[PDB]
Design a protein around this motif. Sequence first.
Motif, PDB file in Angstrom:
ATOM      1  N   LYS B  13       9.049  44.611  19.288  1.00 23.44           N
ATOM      2  CA  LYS B  13       9.506  45.620  20.235  1.00 23.44           C
ATOM      3  C   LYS B  13      11.025  45.645  20.278  1.00 23.44           C
ATOM      4  O   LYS B  13      11.642  46.717  20.233  1.00 23.44           O
ATOM      5  CB  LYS B  13       8.920  45.351  21.622  1.00 23.44           C
ATOM      6  CG  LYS B  13       7.411  45.560  21.679  1.00 23.44           C
ATOM      7  CD  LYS B  13       6.857  45.432  23.091  1.00 23.44           C
ATOM      8  CE  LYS B  13       5.422  45.951  23.160  1.00 23.44           C
ATOM      9  NZ  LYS B  13       4.809  45.776  24.508  1.00 23.44           N
ATOM     10  N   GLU B  15      13.098  44.862  17.923  1.00 24.45           N
ATOM     11  CA  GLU B  15      13.586  45.593  16.765  1.00 24.45           C
ATOM     12  C   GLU B  15      13.553  47.083  17.060  1.00 24.45           C
ATOM     13  O   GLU B  15      14.578  47.772  16.959  1.00 24.45           O
ATOM     14  CB  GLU B  15      12.759  45.260  15.523  1.00 24.45           C
ATOM     15  CG  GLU B  15      13.478  45.585  14.221  1.00 24.45           C
ATOM     16  CD  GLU B  15      12.700  45.153  12.993  1.00 24.45           C
ATOM     17  OE1 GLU B  15      11.677  44.452  13.151  1.00 24.45           O
ATOM     18  OE2 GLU B  15      13.104  45.514  11.866  1.00 24.45           O
ATOM     19  N   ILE B  16      12.391  47.572  17.511  1.00 33.63           N
ATOM     20  CA  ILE B  16      12.198  49.002  17.751  1.00 33.63           C
ATOM     21  C   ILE B  16      13.329  49.553  18.602  1.00 33.63           C
ATOM     22  O   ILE B  16      14.068  50.451  18.178  1.00 33.63           O
ATOM     23  CB  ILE B  16      10.833  49.266  18.414  1.00 33.63           C
ATOM     24  CG1 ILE B  16       9.696  48.753  17.532  1.00 33.63           C
ATOM     25  CG2 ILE B  16      10.665  50.751  18.680  1.00 33.63           C
ATOM     26  CD1 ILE B  16       8.314  49.155  18.007  1.00 33.63           C
ATOM     27  N   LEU B  19      16.649  50.016  16.834  1.00 35.69           N
ATOM     28  CA  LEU B  19      16.615  51.191  15.974  1.00 35.69           C
ATOM     29  C   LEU B  19      16.773  52.462  16.789  1.00 35.69           C
ATOM     30  O   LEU B  19      17.640  53.295  16.498  1.00 35.69           O
ATOM     31  CB  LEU B  19      15.307  51.214  15.180  1.00 35.69           C
ATOM     32  CG  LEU B  19      15.188  50.100  14.139  1.00 35.69           C
ATOM     33  CD1 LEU B  19      13.881  49.339  14.274  1.00 35.69           C
ATOM     34  CD2 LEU B  19      15.344  50.658  12.733  1.00 35.69           C
ATOM     35  N   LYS B  20      15.971  52.601  17.849  1.00 40.74           N
ATOM     36  CA  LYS B  20      16.038  53.813  18.657  1.00 40.74           C
ATOM     37  C   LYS B  20      17.459  54.054  19.138  1.00 40.74           C
ATOM     38  O   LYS B  20      18.030  55.130  18.908  1.00 40.74           O
ATOM     39  CB  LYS B  20      15.070  53.716  19.833  1.00 40.74           C
ATOM     40  CG  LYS B  20      13.628  53.457  19.425  1.00 40.74           C
ATOM     41  CD  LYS B  20      12.669  53.792  20.547  1.00 40.74           C
ATOM     42  CE  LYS B  20      12.318  55.270  20.554  1.00 40.74           C
ATOM     43  NZ  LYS B  20      11.325  55.566  21.620  1.00 40.74           N
TER      44      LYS B  20
END
Lengths: 29, 29
Positions: B13, B15-16, B19-20
């Motif tokens: 999560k 990481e996500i 990125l976002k």
Amino acid sequence: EIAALKXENAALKEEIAALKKEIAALXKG
Amino acid sequence: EIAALKXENAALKEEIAALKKEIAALXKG
Ligand SMILES: [Cu+2]
Ligand SMILES: [Cu+2]
């Protein structure tokens, strides 16, 4: 439990990949 | 098991989100 959790893992990885590709797109243009 | 797996979830999560945010940055400029 673990089953769905592993699913929750798998799903999340798939989100990640998408984002990464997106960035590459945005990076290439 | 689940412990580390949940960790593997948490980590992913994180990481996500990164990125976002990145995309937002690239989107704002
Ligand atoms: Cu499948
Ligand atoms: Cu912590």
